[PDB]
Amino acid sequence: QKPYKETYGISHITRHDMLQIPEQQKNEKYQVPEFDSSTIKNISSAKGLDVWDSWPLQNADGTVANYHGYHIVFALAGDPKNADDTSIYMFYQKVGETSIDSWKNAGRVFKDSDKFDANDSILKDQTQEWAGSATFTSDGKIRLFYTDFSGKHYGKQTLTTAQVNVSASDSSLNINGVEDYKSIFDGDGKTYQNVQQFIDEGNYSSGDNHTLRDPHYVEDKGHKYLVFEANTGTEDGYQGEESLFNKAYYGKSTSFFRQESQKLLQSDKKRTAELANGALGMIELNDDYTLKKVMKPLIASNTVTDEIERANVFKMNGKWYLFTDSRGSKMTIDGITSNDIYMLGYVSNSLTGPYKPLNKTGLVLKMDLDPNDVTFTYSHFAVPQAKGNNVVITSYMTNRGFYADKQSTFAPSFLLNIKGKKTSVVKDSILEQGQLTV
């Protein structure tokens, strides 16, 4: 098995960069704040739902949109005891308020019938609704993007869109229904793994982790795009035993490649590394939001992990920043443990690449999963702001231990300072639960 070097023209999360993280993450500038349990309330208008991954309605540039005098937050919600109830709800608050009680609930985006009424064959097998993005179009529409999950068909994941038709009521917002409800993309095998490859390899029993979800909408130069979590296909850098010999996945030096590769090949994470081919992918959309072009991934994570979630990208102060959430338990880097959860981050002069790691390693946030902690935040997401050097970091917060009258809720947002290729958690920047702008 001969060593080689092949980048496929895309950026890579290398083992050398990741191996720096266990020592770097000890610094407070990279650590998600800790929120005392006494400061936290349920989203009252959720009426007892557990509210998880959320994303705001954004203008094309990523900033928060103003719809009819309201901010809009879509969120996955349901109950921890029944995953197939997991569904997208549309919350909203009138611009200018930050209190958590100001968040109103317009209910589920979709009726159970909507997937059946839609001229779409993949929507028929949907069993859960997973995360995505939403944009306030020039026509004044609410254009939603999310993940079609099919528990029936081997966990297929499909990038899906729909326009959410909404009325205003002087008092409130109300969902009238959806249209242009359709599938967009589900992998092509050669650039992005698809469920067929997953099935052909032995579905779940292979240990592989097939992802294709969390589309994030972004425009640039009158082009519409979706950046999303995925896995590499056969013609980028695909998974397999051979992938551990591509030097591009290691970085640094050929000296380092030999040292790391041999140790990896004897590590008990060897197999996990061979199957690890996570990717932040990209496709161009036509003006009707249908597939126009499958573009090469913005970055891949071969041998490092199979799962880089919640792709996020936006232009800010002249540079493009790219973020993804990732679990330490699913990584194969020595020093990175199951107690650690991350937001990684990269920067580029153009939306389409090439991307270099922020803070020299890609580390932006590390959230600790110790037990003696009562609360935990998850699914961190950077929300760009109109002016300034700070982005708002939203997340959802859960509590250690069960309470019949406490659910997953909006975490207190905080600020992340972004300057050039360096980021820093702003100390004393705690906002209200779910606050989007500062």
Q: Measured from the CB of residue 239, what is the shortest distance to Ca ion in angstroms?
A: 5
Task: Indicate the residue among 9 and 240 with the shorter CB distance to Ca ion.
Answer: 240
**Region 247-286 residues binding Ca ion, contact defined as CB under 5 A:** 275, 277
Q: For this structure, is 268 an active site residue? A: no
Q: Which residues pair with 231 in a beta bridge?
A: 278
Q: Measured from the CB of residue 333, what is the shortest distance to Ca ion in angstroms?
A: 16
Give phi and psi for 362, each to the nearest 5: 100, -15
- Distance, in Å, from the CA atom of 309 to the CA atom of 161, rounded to the nearest integer, reads 19
Number of residues binding to Ca ion, judged by CB under 5 A: 6
* Active-site residue, from 53, 274, 306, 340: 53
Task: Indicate the residue among 164 and 273 with the shorter CB distance to Ca ion.
Answer: 273
| Contacts with Ca ion, 318-357, as mask; x by CB under 5 A | ----------------------------------------
Query: Tokens representing 198?
Result: 């997953």
Task: Indicate the residue among 258 and 271 with the shorter CB distance to Ca ion.
Answer: 271
The torsion angle over the Cα atoms of residues 201, 338, 229 and 209, rounded to 10 degrees, is 10
Residues with Cβ within 8 Å of 302's Cβ and at least 6 positions away in sequence, in order, are 12, 232, 237, 239, 243, 246, 249, 276, 277
| Contacts with Ca ion, 284-323, as mask; x by CB under 5 A | ----------------------x-----------------
* Active-site residue, from 214, 236, 309, 340: 309
Q: For this structure, is 309 an active site residue? A: yes
**Region 136-165 residues binding Ca ion, contact defined as CB under 5 A:** none
Q: Measured from the CB of residue 306, what is the shortest distance to Ca ion in angstroms?
A: 4
Nearest residue to 146 via CA among 177, 173, 117, 181? 181
Task: Indicate the residue among 232 and 423 with the shorter CB distance to Ca ion.
Answer: 232
- Distance, in Å, from the CA atom of 148 to the CA atom of 182, rounded to the nearest integer, reads 10
Q: Measured from the CB of residue 26, what is the shortest distance to Ca ion in angstroms?
A: 30
Q: Measured from the CB of residue 279, what is the shortest distance to Ca ion in angstroms?
A: 9
Nearest residue to 311 via CA among 341, 280, 282? 280
- Asked if 50 is part of the footprint of Ca ion (rule: CB under 5 A), the reply reads no
Q: Measured from the CB of residue 387, what is the shortest distance to Ca ion in angstroms?
A: 41
Task: Indicate the residue among 332 and 413 with the shorter CB distance to Ca ion.
Answer: 332
**Region 188-247 residues binding Ca ion, contact defined as CB under 5 A:** 208, 231, 239
Report, as residue numbers or ranges, the catalytic residues.
Answer: 53, 309
Q: Give the interface with Ca ion as residue ranges (CB under 5 A).
A: 208, 231, 239, 275, 277, 306
